[PDB]
Each structure stands twice: as structure tokens, then as C-alpha cells.
């Protein structure tokens, strides 16, 4: 193919069901109904026309650029939209249900691969997954249709609410004696001019009570009987709902008004809630019916592991496409290890060293482990390694991991071929036990051949019924202590547990139940390489008291592979994890899916159900999976999971396709500049840019679609004049849409997004997630350090969107608005003068307060997380006075950090003084930092959990648990609070 756009008219060769072929000239925009009709009109000029049936009997098939033999059932599609590999169409008679095939094509477009590639998969586990997971789809679709239309409105437009109604007193103190003033709008004319109705209401009113006050204030002069008034209230309560002016957020559930995030922000930011009164039948009118059709693929002697009286043994045969310089490195060998998560269950064993030119070992490897002692989550981790010396030095060539038990509980037997994976960039370790289990699908990859023992029959892991028996069989064979348990409970997830502490915890495993959050430390104390201790641990886990979600999430990382542990953790989430905090931790919950041994597990069924019943999290569930589909190590799991989602998410697939299509023409457009058209400068890039965006097929695709950063934001028409390509980083696009909302003027009329391509963005998602987290806990603890976690979404391989904040500048841009003072030196007071000029009068002290508070927060966050490379062009400040950082490419000081704070900030903090650090304003600023820093330390567990769940992500900043040690130093977790303050205080003074 290799054609960016098809010419105006092209000649497509049409293959008829007789022998004939017809070259048919047809317009690029021509539809298949047009093509077919004109074809069968042209076909009369060719021989054997008698054999042709009426065109109604046939459809077109052709090959796509994805190599798919696609049946073009949907004949309303356009020739240029077919993704044809070559311009030809084969006339054939349709076979198979039309709706499945038209749906499969739009699913394949959304997930990015032809669904038929799943049909052609040998693995039984793949076919079992896409068959068995359909029950999670049906019960999610049945659930959302129970109480239609309201239940369907709750699915597509779920309440955006905080986790609890109780306002933090810091926020409640802004209310007018516990009341809030709101303005309610009505569109009262065909020309659509609006009427106001301002109310003052108790902050905890539910939306229906707000409707009752609106009608009370409107009827105050109607002299209505108390009974007749209630008839008006009952009517409007049952006939209208409230909407946020400017975006698609609706108050459909009877939560207190103050815990709707839009309005708790208006209380925080002292703004005026603007709500539109809307007929709920007009809302339901924009929710077309959808149905979950069950797909076509939903149709159509052993012995125990504990009776194999032998030690483990695995054979390494040979390897194929190994890429080594025969004359540079001496020999190669296969390294192996038996692992349970990250813990090796026994010492590692290598094959002999063999010449490069003959990767032949034919070795049985013996492991120091009695087969019955194998834990269910046990797995084999291997790699081909090279050696050279003159010290001896090793380094790996490729790796691969294998589950010793498959998804059916059976123990692997017989020969097995395993195509290995490239070693990840910047990994020297010989094995990669945190990588995925699986074989590399790519061709000409080094294939390592193995063999497992065959014990005369298929071996199965024992049933839990037998395990609890052995537990009862094995078990038959105070004040200072409970302070020990409480003390060990306090320590963070990555604390050092000594051998004395381990078997102390295990010795008191029955008294640990009184302190349920001790479970992670206790599970790490188990001898997982012993059938006995594991059997007893299953019995404890079976009746273990549930723990808070943010501690259960720990048990889903790579240190806790056992399916009983993970099952307990998932049951904690699906009972305690609110949809709010689920949506907030979704990035980590999607990542730890990678650690899962098998496709069908309790976590993925949890995430899928909640994703098919809450379209707010289902949206980001899709993009977090879609953004990673390029990676072949996880392409299959996420692909099948995306299939099950797009097959049941309902009418929202139509909107996801518009987003995917729009993002596609943005990456294709940006690729042409950043990779091909590199010779040309900015001004010639601009005139080039607009000509692309003048095209109708581009405008039609980049206008009228939902924002991936927040689907409640509609992106209408483009303001081409405001669009531009920025002069920074890898030349990102600045895009601007009109907000088509009926009342856009009350929120924002310009929606501006930055589209960047070339550098990894999921460092930013994590740090921006973290920043939002530590902002939320400061507010709840009485610190009003306003942070700015602007929106950011990775949509593909080093490509994504960034929410730009209005009325903001870099401090570099502000220094350029002032003058010079020292020789070739900007005036350090320029920043303060700029805040004075934009906050004249009584709003001056406020801006300096907002600057000092927001500054304090970002100083603590950057120091803790190790964000380096902080300079004047990635530090920004609003006209408001709020300060925030951008471009979080690094963290954990990934350089092969100081406490940043420049004179320009000090002269704002000190309101322009000369003895900056000796002012009372600066000593107040230090107090903010010391309090903020300490507050993070007392929540350090959930921050370390958030990082440890992302270890398999592929972000080079954190490849191993040792990389998370940077945050244990900045927070000084192995010391006392009083040693931490001194450490933090010194890190601040050491910068002065």
C-alpha cells in the first residue's frame, strides 16, 4: 500500500463470481453500494454475464493493510475508509450473520487488530478465556438494563462524587452557615436565551431538594395550597434533572450536593455553581438502545502432585536463532531458576558452557526442591547468557518464563519449545522473573527447547479439600510480643524483615489475625518451598479478616503470586474499593494484570465488570489497555480483554472509534513532520499544517468527538487559527476546539489540548496521579497547598494528550516580560512585579498566599519523588498566582536531587523584601513545607505500593524494587519522624 491518501479517481479491479475481472474507475469517496451497482452495470459489457445474479446476491471481499480477508457487509462504507492493501474487490456471496461481522470490524478498528486473529490461536487458554469471560459481559449488561432508562443513564453518565459525604472542616468553613449559593438555568426560547434562578441551600441537599427549591422560588407568588405546591415539586422532581453547565455531567443520584466533585470544587475555589435544568426525557433521548449479542465463538485418569516421590528435574535441549559474535565472546550457557514471584524457591542451576556455534546442551537440570513442595504459582525463569573475560563477566542475550502449572492446575510434561524475548533496555540481571510468562510470537527469535518429566499420567495440583487435610495433619506434628506485632505491622511494605522476625511472625501466625493488616509481612515469612507451611497459610487466608483496599492492592503486586492471596485481595477490592478510588488507582490495577499467571483470573473479571457497569472507568480502562497494544509481551492478553469490552460496552464503541480515528490522524499527521519532513523550519511547517487541517476528511474526523482526557468534554469545531505547532520538546501540537455546550460560556468556550509524540508519557501520569494524591491528603489534614494535577493520558507508544491550563506562563516567559538588572541577567524581581501587576489591590495578599502555598507543595513533592531537571521553562505560574510544574520525564533521580527554590520565588514569598530568608513570610513558608513533608511520610505505604505495582510497566526509572529505595531515603523511613524532619530541614537549609 504505502499511500497516505488515494488519488481523486482510481481504477479498482473487480473480480466477478464468473471468470471475469473488470477495471472500474470510481471516485475516492464512492460508497460500496455505488461501486457494486455501477460494477454490475459495467459487467454487462463482459462475457459470461448470464451467470451473474442480481447484485443483491453478492458482497465485496478484499484484503486490508492489516492482512485481513474482510467481508464488506456494511456497504455504506467509503472506498477510502476500507484500508485496502491493493485496489481490488472480489465479488462473492455473503455467508454468516451480518451483525457479528459488521460489529467485529468496528471492534477490530477500536482495539487495533483484526478480531479474526484470535480465532486462529492454538492455545486452549485463549479460547477458554474469550468464551468463559462472556458471563461477566452478560451480567454487566443485564444489570445496566434493570431499571431502564435510569439504569442506562447511570452507566453512561455516572455521578462524579467524592468517596464520602462529610466535608473536611477546612472546606465546610467556606460555607455560609452551612449553606451554598447556586444559580439554576433554563433555556426558555427557541432562539435559546436563558433565565436565571439563584438559590441558597443547605450544602447537603440532594438534587431533588434543589429542584424543589427552584420550583418553590418560582411559585412564591402563585398562592398555591401546600398540597398543590407538592404536586408541582413531585412533578418537576420526576420530570427534570440537573446538569453542569458546559459539560456532560449530570446529577442523577441522591448524593448530597456538596460531594459532587464539581460543587465541592466550587466550595473550595469559592466559585458559583452553575447548573442547567434539563428534562430527563431529553437526556434519555440521547441514550440510544444497545444490546449484547452473544458472539459466534460462544458455542461448540489423573494423579496428585503430592504423590510424585522425586525431586524436580528439567531438561535443556538446544537453542536456535542466537545472535552472538563467535569471535568476540567465548561461550554461551542457559541460566535457570525456580521462582515464586520474585523469590527463588531454590538456588539457581546453569547448564554447561558451550561454544557459540553450537547451542547444544542436552542436559537434565536438577533443582533442590521436592516436587510436592512446589507452590501453585511456581514458575521457571530462564535466559541464554554470554561470558567473556581476561574478571569474568556475564550478561544475558534473551529471556523467557514458564508457569510450571497451566490454567487447568496440571503440571507441565514433555518437550516444549519457547521463543525468547529481548532483554529489556538497561537490565543487567541474568534472569527476568518479573517479566511475563509466554513465548515470543515474532519469527526468527531465539527458540530454546526444553523437556519436562512425564510421570506416566497427567499430574494435577491437589484440591483445596486435600490441602486442608494435610494442614491439620502437619499442625499436630505476650505483651512484649503483641508490641512486636504492632511494630512490625507499622513498617512499610519494603521494610527489612529479618530471619528472626520472619519465623517469629510465623510462630504467632494465629495471633496475627487480631491485627489483620499484618498479612503482607506474614505471607513473606512463609516457606513457600514447603508443602507444609503453605498448606497452613491457605487455612489462615481462608478466614482472614478483610483489610482496607489500599493495603489489599499491595497483595496484587509481583511479590504475591499465590492465587489464594490474590483472590483474597480481589475480594477486598470488590467489597471496599469505591468506584471513585477504583477510578483513581485504575492505572496500577491494569498494570498488575501483567503479573497474573493466567488469562482468566479474579482481578480481570473484577476490573471488567466494574468497567462494563461504569462508563467513566470503562473509558480509561480502554485507553490504558489500548495504549499498550503495541507491546507484544502483553498484546494478546490486553487484546482479548479489549475484545470482551468492546463487545459489551454498548453504544460507546461508536464514540471510542471516533476518538481512535481522530488520534490516528493526529499521530499520522505528527509523524509526517517529526520523522519525514524534518528538513523544513517552523514557518513552513505552519502553512503545511493548516493545509492538512483544511481537508474535509480531516476536519470531519477531528471535529465533533469526545475528549479522551475527559469524555464529559465535547470537542466541537476546530479553531484552525488558534492551532499551532509549539517550539519545544519534540515539536508538540497545540490544539483548540470550540465547546459546543448550550451553556459553554459558563465553563469554558475554548478547549485546548497539547498532543505530544516522541517521548514516554506514563512517567507523567504516575507523578501527576501521585501529586493529586498528596494534594488530597494535605487538604484533608488542614494544609491548603493547592496543586495542579492537570490531565494527561498516554494513548500509545510515546504519544498522548496533555491538558493545558488557561492563563498560565513559564517563569522564563515572565522573566522575558521584564528587564535586565545585572550584566546580562534578568531582574529577579520581575516575577513579583508581574504578580503585583495582575493582582492589584486587596487581591494581592491572596496571590502571594496562593503562590507560597502552591510553591511549598511542589517543593516537597519534587524533592520526595526525585524530579530532577527543574528549570525556568518547566516551572509555570498562573495569573491567579498558583504555581505548578510540567514535563515530568524523570523521577527517582534517574541520572547515571537538591531542594529546588530560587531567589525569584523567595522575593514573591517575602512580598519583595531584601532579607528574604529572615522574613516572617519565609518562616511561614518553611512551616508549610515541614508539615507537608511529614504528612506524606505518615502515608508512605500507599505511595510505595503505587510504585511497586508499576514495576513491570517497562518504565526504566523503576525496573526493580531497589529503584523504589530512592523514596525510602527522601522520606527517611528507616529513621524516626524527628530524624526525618532534621533530614528534610537540612536538605532545605543545605540549599540556602
Amino acid at each position: 500500500w504505502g499511500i497516505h491518501l488515494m488519488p481523486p479517481r482510481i481504477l479498482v479491479e473487480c473480480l466477478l463470481p464468473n471468470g471475469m475481472i473488470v477495471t472500474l474507475e470510481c471516485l475516492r469517496e464512492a460508497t460500496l453500494i455505488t461501486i457494486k451497482h455501477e460494477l454490475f452495470k459495467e459487467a454487462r459489457k463482459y462475457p459470461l454475464h448470464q451467470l451473474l445474479q442480481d447484485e443483491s446476491s453478492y458482497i465485496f471481499v478484499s484484503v486490508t493493510q492489516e492482512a485481513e480477508r474482510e467481508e464488506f457487509f456494511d456497504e455504506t462504507r467509503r472506498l477510502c475508509d476500507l484500508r485496502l492493501f491493493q485496489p481490488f474487490l472480489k465479488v462473492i456471496e455473503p455467508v454468516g450473520n451480518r451483525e457479528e461481522k459488521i460489529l467485529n470490524r468496528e471492534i477490530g478498528f477500536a482495539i487495533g487488530m483484526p478480531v479474526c486473529e484470535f480465532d486462529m490461536v492454538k492455545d486452549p487458554e485463549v479460547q477458554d478465556f474469550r468464551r468463559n469471560i462472556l458471563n461477566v459481559c452478560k451480567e454487566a449488561v443485564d444489570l445496566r438494563d434493570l431499571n431502564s432508562p435510569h439504569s442506562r443513564a447511570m452507566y453512561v453518565y455516572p455521578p462524579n462524587v467524592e468517596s464520602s459525604p462529610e466535608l473536611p472542616k477546612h472546606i465546610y468553613n467556606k460555607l455560609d452557615k452551612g449553606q451554598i449559593i447556586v444559580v439554576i438555568w433554563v433555556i426558555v426560547s427557541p432562539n435559546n436565551d436563558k433565565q436565571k434562578y439563584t438559590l441558597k441551600i443547605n450544602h447537603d441537599c440532594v438534587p431533588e431538594q434543589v429542584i424543589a427549591e427552584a420550583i418553590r422560588k418560582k411559585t412564591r407568588s402563585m398562592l398555591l395550597s401546600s398540597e398543590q405546591l407538592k404536586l408541582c415539586v413531585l412533578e418537576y422532581q420526576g420530570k427534570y434533572i440537573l446538569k453542569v453547565c458546559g459539560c456532560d455531567e449530570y446529577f442523577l443520584e441522591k448524593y448530597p450536593l456538596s460531594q459532587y466533585k464539581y460543587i465541592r470544587s466550587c466550595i473550595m475555589l469559592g466559585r458559583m455553581p452553575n447548573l442547567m435544568l434539563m428534562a430527563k426525557e431529553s437526556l434519555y433521548s440521547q441514550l440510544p438502545m444497545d444490546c449484547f449479542t452473544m458472539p459466534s465463538y460462544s458455542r461448540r485418569s489423573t494423579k496428585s502432585l503430592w504423590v510424585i516421590n522425586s525431586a524436580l528435574r528439567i531438561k535443556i535441549l538446544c537453542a536456535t536463532y542466537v545472535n552472538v559474535n563467535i569471535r568476540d565472546i567465548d561461550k554461551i550457557y542457559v541460566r535457570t531458576g525456580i521462582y515464586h514471584g520474585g523469590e527463588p524457591l531454590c538456588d539457581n542451576v546453569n547448564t554447561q558452557r558451550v561454544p557459540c556455534s553450537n547451542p547444544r546442551w542436552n542436559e537434565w537440570l536438577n533443582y533442590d526442591i521436592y516436587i510436592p513442595d512446589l507452590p501453585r504459582a511456581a514458575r521457571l525463569c530462564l535466559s541464554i547468557c554470554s561470558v567473556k573475560g581476561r574478571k569474568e563477566e556475564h550478561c544475558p542475550l534473551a529471556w523467557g518464563n514458564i508457569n510450571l502449572f497451566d490454567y487447568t492446575d496440571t503440571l507441565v510434561s514433555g518437550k516444549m519449545a519457547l521463543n525468547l524475548w529481548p532483554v529489556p533496555h538497561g537490565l543487567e540481571d541474568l534472569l527476568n522473573p518479573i517479566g511475563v510468562t509466554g513465548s515470543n510470537p515474532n519469527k526468527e527469535t531465539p527458540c530454546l527447547e526444553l523437556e519436562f518429566d512425564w510421570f506416566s499420567s497427567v499430574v494435577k495440583f491437589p484440591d483445596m479439600s486435600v490441602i486442608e487435610e494435610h494442614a491439620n495433619w502437619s499442625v499436630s506434628r505476650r505483651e512484649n510480643d503483641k508490641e512486636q506485632l504492632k511494630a512490625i505491622s507499622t513498617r512499610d511494605p519494603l521494610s527489612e524483615i529479618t530471619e528472626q522476625e520472619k519465623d517469629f511472625l510465623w510462630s504467632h501466625r494465629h495471633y496475627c489475625v487480631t491485627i489483620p493488616e499484618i498479612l503482607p509481612k506474614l505471607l513473606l515469612s512463609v516457606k513457600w518451598n514447603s508443602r507444609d507451611e503453605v498448606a497452613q497459610m491457605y487455612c489462615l487466608v481462608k478466614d482472614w479478616p478483610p483489610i482496607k483496599p489500599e493495603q489489599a492492592m499491595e497483595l496484587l503486586d509481583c511479590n504475591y503470586p499465590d492465587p489464594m492471596v490474590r483472590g483474597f485481595a480481589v475480594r477486598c477490592l470488590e467489597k471496599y474499593l469505591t468506584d471513585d478510588k477504583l477510578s483513581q488507582y485504575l492505572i496500577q490495577l491494569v498494570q498488575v494484570l501483567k503479573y497474573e499467571q493466567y488469562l482468566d483470573n479474579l482481578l480481570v473479571r473484577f476490573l471488567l465488570k466494574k468497567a462494563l457497569t461504569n462508563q467513566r472507568i470503562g473509558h480509561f480502562f480502554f485507553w490504558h489497555l489500548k495504549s499498550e497494544m503495541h507491546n507484544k509481551t502483553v498484546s494478546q492478553r490486553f487484546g482479548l480483554l479489549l475484545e470482551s469490552y468492546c463487545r459489551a460496552c454498548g453504544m460507546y464503541l461508536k464514540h471510542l472509534n471516533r476518538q481512535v480515528e481522530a488520534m490516528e490522524k493526529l499521530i499520522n499527521l505528527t509523524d509526517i513532520l517529526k520523522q519525514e519532513k524534518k528538513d523544513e523550519t517552523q514557518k513552513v511547517q505552519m502553512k503545511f499544517l493548516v493545509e492538512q487541517m483544511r481537508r474535509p476528511d480531516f476536519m470531519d474526523a477531528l471535529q465533533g468527538f469526545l475528549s479522551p482526557l475527559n469524555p464529559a468534554h465535547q470537542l466541537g469545531n476546530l479553531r484552525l487559527e488558534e492551532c499551532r505547532i509549539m517550539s519545544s520538546a519534540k515539536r508538540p501540537l497545540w490544539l483548540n476546539w470550540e465547546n459546543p455546550d448550550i451553556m459553554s460560556e459558563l465553563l469554558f468556550q475554548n478547549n485546548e489540548i497539547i498532543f505530544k509524540n516522541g517521548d514516554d508519557l506514563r512517567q507523567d501520569m504516575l507523578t501527576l496521579q501521585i501529586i493529586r494524591i498528596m494534594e488530597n491528603i494535605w487538604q484533608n489534614q488542614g494544609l491548603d497547598l493547592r496543586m495542579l494535577p492537570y490531565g494527561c493520558l498516554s494513548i500509545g507508544d510515546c504519544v498522548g494528550l496533555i491538558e493545558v491550563v488557561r492563563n498560565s506562563h513559564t517563569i522564563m516567559q515572565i522573566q522575558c516580560k521584564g528587564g535586565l538588572k545585572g550584566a546580562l541577567q534578568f531582574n529577579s524581581h520581575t516575577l513579583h512585579q508581574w504578580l503585583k501587576d495582575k493582582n492589584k489591590g486587596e487581591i494581592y495578599d491572596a496571590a502571594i498566599d496562593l503562590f507560597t502555598r502552591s510553591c511549598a507543595g511542589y517543593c516537597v513533592a519534587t524533592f520526595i519523588l526525585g524530579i530532577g531537571d527543574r528549570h525556568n521553562s518547566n516551572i509555570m505560574v498562573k495569573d491567579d498566582g498558583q504555581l505548578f510544574h510540567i514535563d515530568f520525564g524523570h523521577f527517582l533521580d534517574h541520572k547515571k536531587v537538591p531542594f529546588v527554590l530560587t531567589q525569584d520565588f523567595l522575593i514573591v514569598i517575602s512580598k519583595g523584601a531584601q532579607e528574604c530568608t529572615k522574613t516572617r513570610e519565609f518562616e511561614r513558608f518553611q512551616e508549610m513545607c515541614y508539615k507537608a513533608y511529614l504528612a506524606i511520610r505518615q502515608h508512605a505505604n500507599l505511595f510505595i505500593n503505587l510504585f511497586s505495582m508499576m514495576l513491570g510497566s517497562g518504565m526504566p526509572e523503576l525496573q526493580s524494587f531497589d529503584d523504589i529505595a530512592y523514596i525510602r531515603k527522601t522520606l527517611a523511613l528507616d529513621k524516626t519522624e524527628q530524624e526525618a524532619l532534621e533530614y528534610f530541614m537540612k536538605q532545605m537549609n543545605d540549599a540556602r
Binding site: I21, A67, N325, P344, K391, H394, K975
Partner: protein, 262 residues
Amino acid sequence: MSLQDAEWYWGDISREEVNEKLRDTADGTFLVRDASTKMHGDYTLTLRKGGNNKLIKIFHRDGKYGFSDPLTFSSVVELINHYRNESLAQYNPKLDVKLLYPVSKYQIEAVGKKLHEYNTQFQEKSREYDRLYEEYTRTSQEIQMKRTAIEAFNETIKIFEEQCQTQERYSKEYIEKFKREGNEKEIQRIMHNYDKLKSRISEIIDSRRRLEEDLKKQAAEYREIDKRMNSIKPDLIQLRKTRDQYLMWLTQKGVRQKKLNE
């Protein structure tokens, strides 16, 4: 005889750094640190056993040391020497291993000059490898997309070859009828169209061949880039290990220099 002189005591190095000093090492390799608490008197013994790094707390209570409440050692040195000659099963029968292998702790303008050279060498060989890795992935992208394009050719060619076999089928009985009717014109129309079909199909197999050849030659460059990356990875760790000990050696007498060297 004093702890400060013992080869296997390393002071306040980090847990993360004994992990790097014990990786892929044999059972019985051991160090002793100051506890991560960095509080006076406390130490932690770390020994390898079963491919893992076991942490043993060394308790201190009134000038004597030990792992358990019977602290029966006047010094940390004699505590370590006892278990250097007796199995730790004497303390915990699970740990049937003795301290077999202590990790020893040694193995001005001119060193600043040599640190600068090895660092320059390391940095530019780090750029050497970072360049091949982007060429390795850039070549990987182009290969798997050329592979799908070849499977696209396969599908079109399969669809066209069945078009030939349906032409040769449904045309046979009509050609045979035309020839005995003496209608050469109607036969030439069928051959004119058959030959055009047979010409386009051969144009497509030629485009497949030209890509098969373009791919097979690029998939070999791909393997060769892997060859010479695997040749740089070991030399790159070597260059790193020398600069690290040079920078530490120079940290003992020239902090002012490294502050300006690089």
C-alpha cells in the same frame, strides 16, 4: 582483630548495595553492615542461602552480641569467626550453612586524569549502545510491518488464484460450445479477459518477491545489530565498574576535583 579492620564489615553501605554484591553468588557468602537504622551498636549480618539473601540481626546488649537472648559473644568479630567455623544450624537448624566466603573490602591528579579518561570512554560507549538500540527497534518496526505486508500479498494472491480456477471452470463449457459454433470472437473475448487476469496476478507475485528479498536482507541486518549489541553490553559493564572505583578512590582525597572534573 578489631571489627573496623575485618574484611567482611562494610560500615554504612546500603541494603541495595549488598544485594548487588551477593547476586548470583554461592551459599555462605556474607557481609556485615551497620543496621539500616544507623543507630550505634546495631549490626545486620547478610548471608546467601538458596539463592536468596538472608538478613540476620546482630543484637547488642551491654557490650556483648548475639542473634538471640543468650548473647554469648564479647565482640561482633568473634561472633562471626565462630560461625565461620561452625554451621548456623547450631543457631537455626534451617540454616545449615557456615560463613564460608567473606566479601572482602579491597580487590592524586593522575587518578583524576585516569577517572576522566575511563569516564569519557564509558560515556561514549554508552552512546554507542544507545544508538544501536534505537536502530535495533527502528529495524524491528520495519520488519514486522513488512511481514504483515507479505501475508497481505499471500491473501490477495490466494484470492486471485481462485479467480483463475473459477474462470477456467465456468468458461470451459462455454468456450467448447463457442468453438463448435465457430464463434472465435466470443472466445477471444474470454481469452482477452483471462490473459489480463493472468497478467495482473503475475505483477502481484513479482511485488511479493521484491518484498521477500527486501525483507530477508533487512532481517539479516537485524541479527547483525543484535550481534554487536551483545558484544558491547559486556564491555560496557566493565568500563562502568572501573570508573565507579576510580570515583570512590578519588572521593578519599579529591572531592574538590570531581566537583569540577565532569
